[PDB]
Paper text:
We isolated and characterized two Shigella podophages that have notably different features when compared with classical podophages and instead are most closely related to phage N4. We describe the isolation and characterization of phages Moo19 and B2, including whole-genome sequencing and analysis, cryo–electron microscopy (cryo-EM) structure determination, mass spectrometry, host range studies, and enzymatic assays of the tail proteins. Our work shows that these phages have divergent decoration proteins and unique tail structures, and encode and package their own phage-dependent RNA polymerase, and the tails, which display esterase activity, are dependent on specific O-antigen modifications of lipopolysaccharide (LPS) for entry. Moo19 and B2 are similar to bacteriophage N4—these are all T = 9 podophages, which encapsidate their own polymerases—a hallmark of this phage family.
Numbering used by the authors:
A (entry chain B), B (entry chain B), C (entry chain B): 2 to 233
D (entry chain A): 387 to 450
E (entry chain A): 387 to 514
F (entry chain E), J (entry chain E): 10 to 74
G (entry chain D), I (entry chain D): 16 to 74
H (entry chain F), K (entry chain F), L (entry chain F): 19 to 74
Write the structure that this text describes.
Amino acid sequence: KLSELFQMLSVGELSLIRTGNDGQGIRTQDYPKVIAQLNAGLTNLHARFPLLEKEVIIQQYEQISKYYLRSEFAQMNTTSTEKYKYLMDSPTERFLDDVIRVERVFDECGCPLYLNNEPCCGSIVTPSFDCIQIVYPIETNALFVTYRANHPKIALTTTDLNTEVRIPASHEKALTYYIASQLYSNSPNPETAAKGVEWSQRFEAECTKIENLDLDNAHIAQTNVKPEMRGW
Amino acid sequence: KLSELFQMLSVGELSLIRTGNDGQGIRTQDYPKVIAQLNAGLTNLHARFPLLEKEVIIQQYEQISKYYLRSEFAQMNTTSTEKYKYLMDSPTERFLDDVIRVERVFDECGCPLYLNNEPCCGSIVTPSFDCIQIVYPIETNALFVTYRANHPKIALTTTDLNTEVRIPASHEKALTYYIASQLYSNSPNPETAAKGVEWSQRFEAECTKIENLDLDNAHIAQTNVKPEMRGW
Amino acid sequence: KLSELFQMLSVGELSLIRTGNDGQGIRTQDYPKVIAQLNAGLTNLHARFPLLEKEVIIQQYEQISKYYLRSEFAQMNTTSTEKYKYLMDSPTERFLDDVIRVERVFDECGCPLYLNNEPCCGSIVTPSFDCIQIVYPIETNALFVTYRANHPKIALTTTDLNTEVRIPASHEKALTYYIASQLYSNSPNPETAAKGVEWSQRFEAECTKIENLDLDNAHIAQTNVKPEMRGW
Amino acid sequence: GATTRAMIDILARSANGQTGIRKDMLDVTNRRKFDKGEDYEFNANVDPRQGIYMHVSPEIPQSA
Amino acid sequence: GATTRAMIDILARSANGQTGIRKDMLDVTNRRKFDKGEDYEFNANVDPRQGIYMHVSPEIPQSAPMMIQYQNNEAESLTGVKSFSQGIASQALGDVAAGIRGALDAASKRELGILRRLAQGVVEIGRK
Amino acid sequence: GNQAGMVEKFIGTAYDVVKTVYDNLGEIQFIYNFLNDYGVLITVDSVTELQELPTTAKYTRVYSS
Amino acid sequence: VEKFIGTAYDVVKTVYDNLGEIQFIYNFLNDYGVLITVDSVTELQELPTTAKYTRVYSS
Amino acid sequence: FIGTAYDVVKTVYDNLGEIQFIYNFLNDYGVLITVDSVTELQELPTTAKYTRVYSS
Amino acid sequence: VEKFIGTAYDVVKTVYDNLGEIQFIYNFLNDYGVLITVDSVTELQELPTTAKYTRVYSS
Amino acid sequence: GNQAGMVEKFIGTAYDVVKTVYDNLGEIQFIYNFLNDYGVLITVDSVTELQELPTTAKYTRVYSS
Amino acid sequence: FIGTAYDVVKTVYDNLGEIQFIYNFLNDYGVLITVDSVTELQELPTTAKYTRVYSS
Amino acid sequence: FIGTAYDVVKTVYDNLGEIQFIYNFLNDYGVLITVDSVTELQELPTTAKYTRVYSS
């Protein structure tokens, strides 16, 4: 939970600094400063490691060819006045703007489609960082975009400490070292800047350790299918 | 939004500096200083990464052979007194001078044309940094220039903090480090200049990280078509 | 515009120096000092990059064999008392002495001519840095010299801040770093000279970056025509 | 058939003719002179034996 | 054809004759002397073995001729005709001498298998 | 591509209007026909202008005080 | 050379230029209605049911 | 080939002349406008000086 | 091109869109009951035992 | 895959309701049939509306004060 | 192939029209609601103005 | 070859002599200038000392 992370930061890592309040808990006024750094740390960990991969269904409309990955066009977000909401969200999968990289794209039946392929004029291109361009949209089709997902963003004004930070206990130290590095690096004092650099190096060492141990089952080899494809 | 970026700069990165106002928000008098640096940072990120690619239609006139990529000749910009507005803008695609590199040039039907090719006397040459020279213009034709696009420039006198900064959350830190580097490097103090250099190195490390992870799907390989072209 | 460049120099880059007036705008007495450095920066960028290439028509006279590239012999410059004005300028192309390098030379029909070729006694030689020697001038011919062009020089006594500085937004930082380097390097103070050297190195790094990304479409390869020439 | 296809893949998918030129080698005029086919003139900080490289197909391994 | 085209591409698209000269090698007069063809005189800070470079076409990899030969060997093994060859198959049609018929190898028998059919066609024409 | 991108680029927010017009295109043709033959009752705001109307305007309503 | 007359861009742009007239047609269809007048009752019948406002002039 | 949006746009384009004639006729002469209730009469633009209402 | 009509996603989403009606049916089945009326006693018998509430109109 | 993932994604917490409805589907059909033939006793809150009901509604209970 | 969940969902989907008709009929006209005890009568929604209770 | 702009320029150039003669005749002798309304009469240059106006 966020309370545990705040206590851990207050005593042990952010101890000899103002934000830690001498190990008596993070002040209720410095929340929008640890939370901003925490969002960056969670984004870094969720982009460098595959801690959350999710899929989103994009319903194709006859007059729309550029589909934006924004919650304003979501089926569950009822606050938006968009006439056509092509994102197909469910109470289970909500699509809270947590998109880090669009990896794979499928169709309604389940056949993979090419992504960003120029020679094949049947591929789904990506114009901008959050858009999906379908040159050939059909009113009776739906996409099945799968992406690497981010942690649901914790608002800067969040006050409830029961908001759960969903990271494995192995990356707790990596996140904490990242937060310490980011908070220690703001000041231009050489002595404090050196500590910030040391925290950055230690965070990059923890990440290297987790990569070397593959605690998230990311770098796992697959069955070779090249002989079958080449006709052996 | 711009308010979130201003708060993030004020507390955490531009903390021990005048522009940060000791972590109580950027002053309403220092806006035209963070905004000038923010425009440079957005331009750098949008030129080094393909965060926005857009197309513009250039209608050919019988008497015009040098077509300038300026909003003064746009179809939607009604403030200009130009007799012939050959840029074909729409409420969707507006062409707000956000041109970084003219990459590909097509025709009305959709057949690619050569760009800056000397031996072929049917190629679209580029005289200046914002011009398109058509040696053979026809009154019943239109171009389909596609370019890498920049973020719509935020005016130096902008006061509304609801102007949205459209960058992925992964490049938020890269942009913030760039802003810190630019603001810290103005002073000739060796101690502050060292911090500016460190921020520049950290920005160039974040950019290298994003390049290595390809979070924008930029360096993706394509299907090989050389055997087909060579007649194998 | 020049006003935006002056403001950007005043706050952010030329901040901790006299010319910046502590970030309250460049004084109306220091204009002929930023403008002199700005002209040098624009000349450097326009000579190292092809930001402006232009052509000039030189009408050949029977008694003239050495043609000088000076506005005193221009057709539009009516202030000069020259009997023969062989430069053929138009309201569109004015030839404001903005010549950086004479690259290619053509004839009236459009057939390329050799430049500075000794063995061929039909080539247009270049005696001085601004002269064009035609050993065989004909009263019924005209040249089509094409050169890399400079930014129209901003006068040292210029007071109107609406004079537009025509550079792409990607080279804004390169120009600003060059101006900072030139202004910081005048003083012999070791501490300030080090900052000037750092600005020079950063300018040369920005130029290297733009060269590596080819934002001006300069280093683009051409179609190979050697097999056709060699008879393959 | 598989070994023949592998040999053809090694010989074909490669770059036979694609010649790379170092960006900071020749100026604007010397680049045109080199492209035309005449003698060129390079800067004092670059070497012709390293700046210009013409790709050739890698040799098929003797095992195939 | 593809391998021959690749060989020609390697040999042709290269620079055969383009000679590079280092910019800071010879002064104005010595450059002219070198261009004319006489003896030159270079500065003390440059080396002639590095300043002057004449480009030559890169050598064709030995794999391309090997593949050409192999695909020209898999054709002579499928049809049966092999370039300049000594053949008896044209002299072994019909009732011939034993010595002539006794020098029939595999290629000659392959070539005779078509000759007999072509002669059967002529015999069927002659019967008509 | 089925040229849907062009429709989005130019008719992005007016596609509802365009589709509604296309749905009632037969009634659009009917309304085009009636008007053509002055089949509608033309109204004028005063006299000495009812004469300025084409003779085909068989049906007219004049406004007076 | 080739002249591009009547292509997809031309049709789409021609429709876009006439978007004001299309909007006027939509408003005329959805908001209000016009009075359609005929000469005889037979014609009232020969009229489509979309004419909810009719006037017949008889002797 | 399913160009539904382009099919609709082309079908509208083929009858664009009828729309132009209708707009010109309605903006040139001025006809009688009939509205069902008194409400949309008030919501009518002021350019329609001539109105008729049908009630029960 | 292929039109995907009636696939697994279509059926599942059609069921999901009608989840309110399914919940109403569940509440009607589990919470309360309706009064089912017939014309004669014979029909009362020809009625399933799930009709725990019956009314017969007789002359 | 047996498409159970789609059911979890869309019917994740309402699967109990869906299964309960599917269990009593025969009784659902029976209840669908009765209502169709106005076999249920329709109730109205006043008079002058019992007439507004379809003639097939043979059975009615009227509420009055 | 054992698609038990999908089999249940498809079986419900095949009879979805009956559910729609039942919901529309019950929300359109208003029928008599019968409840066994007085408790669930109070737990009934206020939308059921007509109720009958069977007791012993 | 579609040189529309050059076709127009060449067509004008072929009749340039007529334009030169017209300009010389109008600037040499001085003819009567006729203008429809009184407005363009005032907007006429002062070089036209001779004017005539047609009104109803």
